Ligand binder design. Structure first.
Ligand SMILES: CCCCCCCCCCCCCCCCCCCC(=O)O[C@H](COC(=O)CCCCCCCCCCCCCC)COP(=O)(O)OCCN
Ligand SMILES: CCCCCCCCCCCCCCCCCCCC(=O)O[C@H](COC(=O)CCCCCCCCCCCCCC)COP(=O)(O)OCCN
Ligand SMILES: CCCCCCCCCCCCCCCCCCCC(=O)O[C@H](COC(=O)CCCCCCCCCCCCCC)COP(=O)(O)OCCN
Ligand SMILES: CCCCCCCCCCCCCCCCCCCC(=O)O[C@H](COC(=O)CCCCCCCCCCCCCC)COP(=O)(O)OCCN
Ligand SMILES: CCCCCCCCCCCCCCCCCCCC(=O)O[C@H](COC(=O)CCCCCCCCCCCCCC)COP(=O)(O)OCCN
Ligand SMILES: CCCCCCCCCCCCCCCCCCCC(=O)O[C@H](COC(=O)CCCCCCCCCCCCCC)COP(=O)(O)OCCN
Ligand SMILES: CC(C)CCC[C@@H](C)[C@H]1CC[C@H]2[C@@H]3CC=C4C[C@@H](OC(=O)CCC(=O)O)CC[C@]4(C)[C@H]3CC[C@]12C
Ligand SMILES: CC(C)CCC[C@@H](C)[C@H]1CC[C@H]2[C@@H]3CC=C4C[C@@H](OC(=O)CCC(=O)O)CC[C@]4(C)[C@H]3CC[C@]12C
Ligand SMILES: CC(C)CCC[C@@H](C)[C@H]1CC[C@H]2[C@@H]3CC=C4C[C@@H](OC(=O)CCC(=O)O)CC[C@]4(C)[C@H]3CC[C@]12C
Ligand SMILES: CC(C)CCC[C@@H](C)[C@H]1CC[C@H]2[C@@H]3CC=C4C[C@@H](OC(=O)CCC(=O)O)CC[C@]4(C)[C@H]3CC[C@]12C
Ligand SMILES: CC(C)CCC[C@@H](C)[C@H]1CC[C@H]2[C@@H]3CC=C4C[C@@H](OC(=O)CCC(=O)O)CC[C@]4(C)[C@H]3CC[C@]12C
Ligand SMILES: CC(C)CCC[C@@H](C)[C@H]1CC[C@H]2[C@@H]3CC=C4C[C@@H](OC(=O)CCC(=O)O)CC[C@]4(C)[C@H]3CC[C@]12C
Lengths: 201, 201, 201, 201, 201, 201
């Protein structure tokens, strides 16, 4: 029977949030982490072993693979999720510490103080997710072709290379895209609601 | 001695369900997850290493494997199970939050409100499972042959490829099919019972 | 100090069982699962990598391996153990739920009802284990030879193939066989005892 | 504060044992399991990949490896340790159940009964460990040579094969041998003490 | 309900630290360990398997790889993080032991004593992190080129070698660099604050 | 709230030890185990796969590798740490059992007894660590060269072999050496202190 303080912190951290938004956002986060950890990781098990190019020059395949894939999508998604998860942890730690400070102050002596930080965290999450989506659109796009052309030294003129299981990777990319879009929509809806309620004072 | 609240939530979430259906559905879910995680995963350990085609052109085997298997069945099953498991988690979280809200309201002051969401969750589970079954029937069918014909560029005209342990994969596919059929039958029986009882008011 | 209810359920679920049979069956189950998970799994680490056939035709080894081994014994044993473990879990869940229902009924108001299901579970376990043993006898037998003859297309006429470490696999097969025989004997002894006691009323 | 019953069972199960023998036997068991699980397992990581024979006939190396090593020592040690650990678990379960039965009997009503089983367990442990040691002496001996001669079909006349890191395996075999000898000595000392005390009545 | 002593130790160990610095430093440490353990480790999965040099002499690639990479960056980062984490653990253990000693002393009898050690720990952390950064700058720099020249025996004159995915490794190196810079800035800010407050007495 | 007995045992087992030595020794042990388990294990991931010798005779590389490395350093370090950790566990178990015996004796009835064993454990730890260090100095030394000469049958006259990443292994060997030296110094300081205090009576 030592769950009262945890419940108190949980209910105090959810003051200004919508009744429905909490469950949707939590289950979306859980779905994202489960999908990232369970099966999509094995799809990128063989990123370079099965990658072959049609040439005889040794060492050309390494540089061609480097140029084709500047960074694997799995680690990009990991960075995205950790960067969208950090601000909530910061907010939780800050509110926990200030609550303990207030508890000590009231034990010894037996708007905007919190909403501003909440809005800052929400806008940071939104801007980070939209920036990551824009970067992914700019670098890789949202389609993969099984044939790639490589024109980097020391490979002569042009060479051809083939990827592995492009359809599966494309499907998973689309899934991550739609999940991120849903997350952005939920965050912007929450921000609109809180701002609309704050206008009415 | 901190299990009273968990038991209260567990008994409150099982209000309108049948006496017998709960145990059957729970053990079916446990059997499905155990079978998916324990042994069937190792059967797909070598999906592309042992896959060989009878040709000398480099790079043809990659595209032939891509065309033969647009998506591995294991990850399809993982997506199916997570999509049929999410709505129950949503329902549980929603009922937990509303119960906490009612507890706070009654502490400070010392049909269809829930059945509609229950029916929505049941119908969502049924439609998702039947849609996944229909998609699996449409794409892969329910039989695998050890010999496949590939007619994709840059392979000349037609080439032949061989899979690995098709009989074992076919057996596991049939097992998953019958498990899904049992799940659908249980869900439709529960829906029929609850609707029949609701007709009598 | 929250183990009283678990102990109550444990002692209530063991009403009609013999004093000695409980420990023997439990330790047999633990021994079986430990042996299956600890060391025998590594013996089947290389099932197809070390399997070689004496031919030059590409792709013949895959179909020959498929025909030689329709299904690996490890996954067959996993299916057998899960199918002999499910009915006990069903019985436990059912008795737990009915006990909670009776507790609620008696709180608000401050033979064959269970033996039939017990006998059904025992007979189901016995019939499933004997069926699995019969299937294993019919398909694989209980001996493995290091040399196998393959006569399947597209391999010409007949080819020869060699397995790996047949003696170790044979020893483990014999071990699993004797364990299953002991389990069947214990189950039939329990059934005989309970029926003999029920005859005397 | 729910450790009183566990302590009661622990002190009741250690009635007739020596004051010093308990700690020595327990730490010996812990040392054995830690050594088996931590580092010696990796030494047998490459049992067949690095095993090479000096021939050109395909498939001869498989049968030669099978004949050279009928069973890996690691799994033999696992079987030995599980077979010497089971009887103590049986004794603990039996004494726990009879203690619960006596507790229920005394709640409702508010030598050789145990020593015989104890001696049976001790003698079973001793006979099993000595039998395993004798079998290991009879089959593998206690020395490994880096060169082995194979005279099994279909290899012509005689062929030569080489093992991997024989010195390390020999050292670990000697370590397991001395640990087993210490265990046997401790068990026989305990049996001698208990019999000598029982003679005096 | 056994968390009071842990909370007491946690609040006593955070006496002289800033209100804001605690959460920032803790979340920075958590982010660092999560990034090190989650995804960056897999990027160095193939450090030597994919490393190829353009030559025919056997054994030259080993020495060229040894000369190119005196030590992998992952283990260097592990050493850095463990060396910057040890002093805080030492401080925590020391304060815990002295608090227990004082508790015993006061039970039986029913500035600079701690700040000096705190400052020592802070300066040790700062000097260790700056030393590690300087060493990394001196040895590897902060850029990797896909082509390397090797001039070590027994390779004739000069040979060329190619690395793998240099861009990803460079990105992760930059990430670790900026994280370390942030950590150093936070530590120096904390030291400046505590010294400035100690000047005023 | 069930930590009082554990704290009592912890404070009673630390009677004669120095105030400062406890934390230093504990953190040294934690650092050693963390370093052994975290990163140094992966450095020996490829001990035999990358080891190549300049010859054409099959099977010579196996015996040359066996002669070059009689035993891997990682398992030697594991044996060293387990052998220096066992005596403390023995002392803890013995003091726990005698404390329980005294508690039972005083409940029913409502120098050198411990220091000798403490000194025995300390001297055993010191002698074991110094013996392991001497053995490591005698067998492997403290330096590794990338080129090794092999003169064992059936290799003709002399052959040359190359190791992998010798610099990293040398650095880790030096690290383990200095850690062991620090441990020996701490143990001898503790022994000197306790003997000096015991002289004064
Ligand atoms: C835990 C199961 C619920 C227990 C429970 O009702 O505890 C309440 C808090 O909720 C809880 O303890 C809910 C805990 C939910 C966190 C689960 C974390 C993921 C799983 C790991 C007590 O708190 P209270 O009602 O006294 O609240 C104080 C403010 N009035
Ligand atoms: C736990 C073992 C049972 C303990 C027990 O009887 O606890 C009751 C709830 O059941 C439980 O606590 C049952 C817990 C079952 C969940 C197991 C989850 C999977 C394993 C991890 C107490 O609740 P109560 O009877 O006071 O209920 C309040 C509404 N009247
Ligand atoms: C737990 C250690 C024993 C504690 C103990 O004696 O608890 C009793 C139940 O036994 C237990 O709690 C035995 C628990 C055995 C389950 C172990 C499961 C495998 C390990 C994970 C209390 O129950 P009670 O005697 O009040 O029974 C109520 C019916 N009269
Ligand atoms: C647990 C730490 C010790 C707690 C303690 O003193 O508990 C006593 C039993 O010992 C214990 O609880 C000792 C537990 C040792 C088992 C450790 C198992 C391996 C780690 C997992 C209470 O029992 P009591 O003294 O009331 O005994 C009743 C018969 N008079
Ligand atoms: C645990 C959840 C919070 C429980 C709680 O409020 O416990 C307080 C300490 O905080 C805590 O117990 C906070 C625990 C935070 C540590 C989490 C470690 C990482 C997760 C594993 C009680 O302590 P108190 O307020 O009586 O303090 C005594 C000095 N006045
Ligand atoms: C646990 C957190 C501290 C709790 C605490 O203060 O418990 C005291 C013992 O310390 C403890 O319980 C310290 C526990 C430290 C062990 C951590 C083991 C590694 C992590 C797993 C109570 O004991 P007491 O002060 O009543 O002592 C009796 C002799 N007077
Ligand atoms: C070992 C794990 C399984 C449990 C211990 C860690 C948890 C207490 C932490 C880790 C990650 C946290 C989550 C990280 C991100 C978010 C998104 C966050 O989104 C919001 O709705 C914004 C803040 C709010 O409205 O509460 C809600 C909290 C949540 C689910 C956090 C809840 C608390 C979690 C589960
Ligand atoms: C770490 C794990 C082992 C325990 C912590 C998580 C559990 C509390 C959750 C995770 C998955 C949940 C299950 C996911 C899906 C379902 C199907 C669901 O199906 C129904 O019968 C519909 C709803 C109902 O009638 O209760 C019943 C609840 C159950 C078993 C859930 C029960 C609660 C579970 C076990
Ligand atoms: C995470 C694990 C280690 C603990 C949580 C799960 C256990 C509470 C369950 C899982 C598997 C169950 C076992 C599965 C099969 C059987 C065989 C069954 O056989 C019988 O004797 C028939 C029924 C009876 O007489 O009780 C006895 C119960 C037992 C050991 C079950 C006891 C309860 C177990 C250990
Ligand atoms: C998950 C694990 C770490 C804890 C849960 C299981 C333990 C409660 C069991 C598992 C294995 C058991 C051990 C298996 C074998 C033995 C040898 C046995 O040898 C004897 O001295 C004979 C019997 C006696 O004199 O008590 C003593 C008990 C012991 C250590 C057992 C003690 C209880 C153990 C640790
Ligand atoms: C099994 C794990 C997940 C929990 C058990 C171990 C923790 C109790 C320890 C392990 C590592 C420790 C951390 C290691 C390093 C630091 C940095 C340290 O930096 C400071 O702010 C300096 C000291 C202070 O101001 O408190 C703060 C404590 C913290 C987070 C420690 C807090 C306590 C931790 C989490
Ligand atoms: C699952 C693990 C993380 C916790 C359960 C096991 C611990 C209770 C044991 C396992 C290893 C033990 C350690 C092994 C070796 C030593 C060295 C030993 O060195 C001394 O200072 C000598 C004895 C003393 O002065 O106390 C101190 C105790 C300690 C840290 C032991 C403390 C208790 C430990 C952590």
């Amino acid at each position: 029977g030592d769950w009262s303080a945890l419940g108190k912190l949980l209910d105090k951290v959810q003051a200004y949030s919508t009744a429905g938004g909490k469950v949707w956002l939590s289950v979306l986060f859980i779905f994202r982490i489960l999908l990232l950890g369970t099966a999509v990781e094995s799809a990128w098990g063989d990123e370079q072993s099965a990658f072959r190019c049609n040439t005889q020059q040794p060492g050309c395949e390494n540089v061609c693979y480097d140029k084709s894939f500047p960074i694997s999508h799995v680690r990009f998604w990991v960075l995205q999720i950790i960067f969208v998860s950090v601000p909530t942890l910061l907010y939780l730690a800050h509110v926990f510490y200030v609550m303990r400070k207030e508890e000590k102050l009231n034990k010894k002596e037996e708007r905007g103080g919190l909403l501003r930080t909440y809005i800052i965290s929400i806008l940071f999450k939104s801007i980070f997710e939209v920036a990551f989506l824009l970067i992914q659109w700019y670098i890789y796009g949202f389609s993969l072709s099984a044939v790639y052309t490589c024109k980097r030294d020391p490979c002569p003129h042009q060479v051809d290379c083939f990827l592995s299981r492009p359809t599966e990777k494309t499907i998973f990319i689309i899934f991550m895209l739609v999940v991120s879009l849903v997350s952005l929509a939920l965050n912007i809806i929450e921000l609109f609601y809180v701002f609309f309620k704050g206008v009415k004072d």
